[PDB]
Amino acid sequence: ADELVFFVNGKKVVEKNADPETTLLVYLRRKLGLCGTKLGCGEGGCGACTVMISKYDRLQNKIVHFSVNACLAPICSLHHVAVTTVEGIGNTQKLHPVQERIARSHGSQCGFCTPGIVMSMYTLLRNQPEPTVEEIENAFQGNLCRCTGYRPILQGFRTFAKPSLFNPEDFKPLDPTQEPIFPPELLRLKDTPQKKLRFEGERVTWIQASTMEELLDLKAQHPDAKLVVGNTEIGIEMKFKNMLFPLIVCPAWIPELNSVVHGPEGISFGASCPLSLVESVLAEEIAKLPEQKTEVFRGVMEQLRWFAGKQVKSVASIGGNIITASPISDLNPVFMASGAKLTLVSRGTRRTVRMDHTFFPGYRKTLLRPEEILLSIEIPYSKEGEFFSAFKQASRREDDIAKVTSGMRVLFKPGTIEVQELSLCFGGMADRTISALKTTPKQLSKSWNEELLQSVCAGLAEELQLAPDAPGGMVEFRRTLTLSFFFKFYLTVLQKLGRADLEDMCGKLDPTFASATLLFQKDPPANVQLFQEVPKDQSEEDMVGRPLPHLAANMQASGEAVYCDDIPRYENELSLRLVTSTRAHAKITSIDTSEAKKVPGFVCFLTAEDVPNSNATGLFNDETVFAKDEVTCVGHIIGAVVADTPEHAQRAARGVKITYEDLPAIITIQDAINNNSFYGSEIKIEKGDLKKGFSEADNVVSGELYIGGQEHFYLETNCTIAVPKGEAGEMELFVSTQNTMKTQSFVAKMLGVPDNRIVVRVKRMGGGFGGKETRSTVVSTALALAAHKTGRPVRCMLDRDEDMLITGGRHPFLAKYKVGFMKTGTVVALEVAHFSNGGNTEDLSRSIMERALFHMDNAYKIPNIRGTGRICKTNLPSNTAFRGFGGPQGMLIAEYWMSEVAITCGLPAEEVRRKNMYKEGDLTHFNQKLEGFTLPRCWDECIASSQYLARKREVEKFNRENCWKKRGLCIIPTKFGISFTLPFLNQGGALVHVYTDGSVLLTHGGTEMGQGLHTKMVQVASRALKIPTSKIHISETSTNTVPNTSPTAASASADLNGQGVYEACQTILKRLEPFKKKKPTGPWEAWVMDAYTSAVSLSATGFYKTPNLGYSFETNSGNPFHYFSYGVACSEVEIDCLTGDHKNLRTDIVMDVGSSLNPAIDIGQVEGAFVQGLGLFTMEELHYSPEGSLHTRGPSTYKIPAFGSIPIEFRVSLLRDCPNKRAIYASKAVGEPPLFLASSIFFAIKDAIRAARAQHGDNAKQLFQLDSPATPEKIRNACVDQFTTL
Template sequence: MMQVSGEAVYCDDMPFIDGELFLVLVTSPRAHARIISLDPTEALSMQGVCDVITAKDVPGENEFSYYEWPDRLMAGDEVLCVGYIVCAVVADTPEHAKKAAKKVKIIYEDIEPVILTIEDAIKHNSFFEPEKGLNYGDVDEAFKTADNILKGEIHIGGQEHFYMETQSIRVIPRTENQEIEIYAATQDPTYMQSLVAKALGIPSNRVSCHVKRIGGAFGGKIVKTAYIAAIAAVAAKKIKHPVRCILERGEDMLITGGRHPYLGKYKVGYMNDGRIVAADVGLYSNGGCSGTESVVIMEMSVLQTDVSYYTPNLKCYGKVCKTNLPSNLSFRGFGFPQCALITEVWIDEVASKCNLPAHQVRELNMYRKVITTPYKQVFDTTNLTRCWESCMERSAYHTRREDIKQFNIGNPWIKRGIALIPLKFPVAFSAAFQNQAAALVHIYCDGSVLVSHGGTEMGQGIHTKITQIASRELGIPISYIHICETSTTSVPNTISTAATVGTDVNGMAVKNACEKLLKRLEPISSKNPAGSWENWVSEAFFQRISLSATGYFRGYETYMDWEKGEGRPFEYSVYGAACSEVEVDCLTGDHKNIRTDIVMDTGCSINPAVDVGQVEGAFVQGIGLYTTEELKYSPGGSLLANGPGEYKIPSVSDIPREFNVSLLSSSQNPNAIYSSKGIGEAGLFLGSAVFFAIKDALSSVRKERGLSSTFTLNSPATPERIRMACGDKFTDMVTALHLALDLKFYCITVIDKPSLMREVAGQKQGLMLCSDLLLKKKKKKKTLEITAGSLSFRTLFI
């Protein structure tokens, strides 16, 4: 209720303290350069400015590692991307700090090469080591037995976290014992505590980190949030004043990175009936300028490349590209949405090559019953089949598919498409130590209960579910229970709230604490079974029985041995299926989401309303990833899509007109609390059902125009890409222009029938084009042979 009424207090809503200052980050405008000099003199002379904080002001460590990859709080003598933090200005108001930040004079010397794309990184052999790979069966021999071989590649763009609350930090220095108090929007208060302590050169026990609630995070408030907190803490300690740092949206998008763009290359052997016999898949991700979380994310992608399908012979390798972009980070799905789309693309193309319905090929190759994955972990996939069949029935898939065929016959410019996509999403941190959790439960003399745990509330409803767990264990109403905040002073050594296990592990820790308290109360309640909860608590206090208990959950026994190519990196899987129908305007490339039906296996749900909300939200975010959200960079590495005006997140009009979400009935999961399942991340990939429905609609229009139904549609499927995939004389003209622009020459075309020509001008190039132009991509010296109908002519480049 506090959320929807606007009463909920976020970090920047907290009242200002006397003497509180504001910090603004100064970032690099260069993608790769040495810092020749940094002169803050003019900035320091400006109104309200207190100080300019640089790497030299860090009393402890400026260089550190997340996992094993080195990084810096602030640049020393080199910047590695546009948006790299160089220094910070502290002033009495945000306006004064912003003005002064522009006056810090920094002289750079560019360093070559500047690597921005995956293709650039491959060309320059720029990778983070080690490469991760998995080899199951005998791929090379299996290719020899296949009826057909398919080769291809697909690009998947990145995604901005675009949480509603931008990065937000408040640091309050205490006068005694070097104590630092932090209020932050972070998914990992313990990591923030540790990093701040290292930067200040003090023990972690002097740093307390508090998280009331977070306005969305999606994986983007772990690493970079801690960096900003550490810089703010350095400033607060040096100036001896509280410091607040709240990033504006453009700054946030520039500095923080997002989901990794991927390039997938695949070679697939298949039989004429659509059965897959072998697949060799290469995954390349754009990690940015630091490895940070990228290699671990790639590990997950390699492990999950099988998705929902049995491939008897599978080889997969993953490489993380080192580029001059901000370090990309974890994002809801943690590598799964990229690798899963790549697999679904080649499944879809096999269906097209075999002239079979896509759902038939998916069904033919889908896992059934108890299976062994390529990394030799056993899963029972019965619920995968149940979700698939239930979704097919609830969506009336076959009937609507026939209706769509009839609709498309009568509509040359508007086409509809439908797709049914399965889901097998494995859950848990692959490193066992990250699955542990702790909790603290206090019972007060009036019977009220205060619960503290290591998870952070970021809109996913973890506090709601934890309250329900405590209520169930203690046998008291929810109204008796309160969760104040997440704090390192209450529960130490927490793990980040991520990997879909937040409720799983923290719920078990709370359950453990409640069981201890009930055991202490049992002698009193057994003597007075008719007594009230309040009576028992009061009596326990007078009998000097402790009414406070810590709870602990050791976590799941997960591991992965990459040398052997086997392990148990996950605890269980979430299963699901989605059916989406779209309508594509072939003249504009626009599409409408008509209907989506989702069936999701959530186990025995602790809170079905919360779970349905998570599935809906994840699905819509998946629509954004695969259809609308496109990050664009300048040739110099500057982010061009740096705000909602240039970056299109899904809006209310992108939500399917009819949206049905059902939870699979009679599902049990003995691996998690109360037989439930974590649901936060899994549903995002189901947004790809819209992507493949668009491809289905495009296949229809391409067949009408005599074009192949096997074609590449890179993600996101923006209107521009959809329009170009339609394939007609107008898109041929654009293709011709792009080729001419790529040649980077001025050109003059000479032809004896100018009435057939139309002129299309580029920024620096001009090309005369016929309306039915077809290009032969064969360049000889400085001429290009062009065929327009029965006319042939040559273009001379000057």
């Protein structure tokens, strides 16, 4: 047969021409129109595409349910299953309890991740209707959220387990009988024998094998045939490595490859057994068998713990990981260390091998012959006197690629501590899984003692040598990890020998060493959210200050909320694919499109030649729409392929051959300094007398700090649909952008038409964070050109890898500082030179440097101060706005030298910070007066509520009692100026209509990107008009309703639009006045109808400009900011001194948001911003080749905070009784200010490292270096000890 048959949300799908290259995600969205399931990365990392699969399992004889990544599931693997998507469980007319709870608990902000998270939770409940808190958290190991900070999702879902922001009492109960039926046809079909299927696509043939005979016959006849089981490797090879396997065979149905057999020597799993089944089988065995038999099983389980998430483990096979033979496989070192038994078969042949060095003979290769397949692996029981450990250290604990991964085994001669067998196996130390074959034989018959410890360590350091240029990098850290892993194993074995009554032979473990051997333990979360109740007299219809949920939260949880790519395609719609430079700096010498033209559906390749008017674009007119003559970064857009489908556009884009002639490249900040390659002149703020200040200072400290950049990772990538109207150059664009005005202007300029022809529309974005303030236009202009040229609508949504490459991120910073201070810790002089890496266009870089300079004081009054900044012009993708906009970088530098002041003085850091803090009425270094200065209030409240002083006691105690784990604790304040640094951008507009039914249609210039702006504006309008929010609607943002709008940026959008909305509403109220006076108690609808029939206008514009702004750098006078935001965070961490990993133990935040417009949204923004800062300072790192090519292009390599990354105790309080009269209804902006507060984690880590260096350092440098981000690499390398010195 050859028809593909499956079910989607209960409806039968019959696909008569299934293409093997078609994924479930593409089929759902494009063939079926079910756009609740999202594309977020296409590589298994984000979980946005999570759906549920149900099938009758013939082996277990029962209906089973599991989650999968739709982005990686071939539809050809799904014959006779039942798919459930977000649409299949409920909708806004009848929400599933999972959907209701995430929406009402404020667990959905931008909403792009919500369906995937809903589906992960839904699947858990279908398997376990009463899960534990631990099981809930484990459900989301493969789900990412960039907006929420995770807290509210887990807190809302905790209600399923075992004023206020929400009320669990109001949540409807679960009734499992109301879930969708398992399609009866599938139960009928489970009696029919499985038959071989053949699917033939455009390039690939897929054979679904029903028997072992069929599989072996096929591999004998065609050894080239590619086995696919879970597709979690092959899917990535095809999508990202441009590999094509024209013949595929799926053996997933074969009983022999799915069997679990218990034998006398161990448990044998068929090679196609999903890792989820291995987990559940081994878990059962560990619980029921004696400890001494399960050492290997527990080692496998420890690795699987940090192996992807539920979606990948549902389909990823044990054999798949083995045969892939990646050097960083987490299972292969464990299988090698335990000498696991592998059965291999072909037609006519059967053999059994023990996994050792011989099994992996080269990079990504095995002992298998081309015609052979792996049948099974026996995972062995452990013996008496046999102990096992497994280790993994990556960049992030959860869902990540190991830097070093290991399996370690020791067997003792009975009744002794003498070594019979020793096996130490490693991933990430060579081009394959290797055994330490030279080191281990030398230890045989030795006693387990200090001498064996040092002997092995000396051996490992010599045997597992890394060249400085080894793939994977981080060579010092990796070498240190191999030694540290063995040390942990050595101490663990000492403990296990003690428990076997051999403690008098091997000796006791020092009690201060015990914590080194503990397996990672989570500890149950504790959250407190505190805010202020509204006045008792306040109307119940007045929602300002009330925790109203995001207006779209229900639709976002149900996948009914429409993002750009969810808009249905026109019948005549075309797809565009950008073609980008693979060189940092080169001449384009020729472009060959010969192969592109051969791709079916190819329309055209657009270049600079095709631009009708102007190829000069960008904020400072220094960018090209399409490259001309030269390319100036890797990612530089050269042209755009147009084709009928996205698949054909991608294929054709690969057929565009470019020839380059390299030109001298400038990559790093130092490169630019050496070449005088900058954007404009030096920027400078200076006050007081520096020479006097430094002479008067008791102490002077100088240093440098590097701060890495940051990728936005908005869950929805850049996307534009451009619809040409065929008249008068008219065009309408639907765009994921924070900047409708620039999108419009840039498109019009390129086309050579007036602004009045071009309409830009934004309903909502799946995140922006600054990344869509300008850089969205590089996609929009290209798509607009395609639409103009063809006269057809054209669409482009960037793949994650394209988006990360092209669109830039936060500016990396280099700082050179010199600070003068008294022995009391009072700072008297400060000189800082800032350098930023701007990339290949100016964009927002100079304003970002201005803000950094505006915040170089952080919270501290400094009488003699000089800050300079220079923006480097380099051959890298242009860097841009990112939440904070230079502020976090400037403030981290301030806190960095401040930490060194306190250490040099020998004084408590909090005391040094407090005594240097501004007071009410002080002037900043830029001469703005600090009025309504609430920072001391935030500080005192945070000190008290966090119990900082009592916890300092406990941290010091912990550090004296533990040698290999250390705690750290820090409290950090912040001041953040609110307003665009460019004065005229501080304006906003609104337009309001009242229809004759009394309903109100409102729009304003701000765009919704998850920050709950529309919700806030509806709350504002409802208070202003004195009508319930139910009568007011906002549908979208568009340039033809409100023109000349500033970007939704600078945290200012609620302030600016709120005032505009307010004014528009006041105009309407003014007009209704005479009708209100005539009918004082008559309803709103009567006034409206009376006004209409009296021919009074029911439409009005509203407008606001922020008064009295305008700073001069020439004279250091004038106010850049309308007001300041203030906040304080105290954070505690615990570091693993042997691995560089750490736990975020507790964070307490007190934030001044004025009289919050909406405390639910505001606490959400505090939490979201904080966790992005947590990422910036501790986790997120971009890596480039020496030639300037970004290596880090997806969630596999770029590690944003995970569910498990957040502080275990997470407390947020909004300051009470602090109205801010100058902004809308006494509120304050909240978007960017809390982000820097995550530096409290950075400095807590620095505190913990200091303690570690005091413990094991040999006269270590006191003012040691810790650049940002403080990653496991930097943490571990800074913990100098006997292992780092070896």
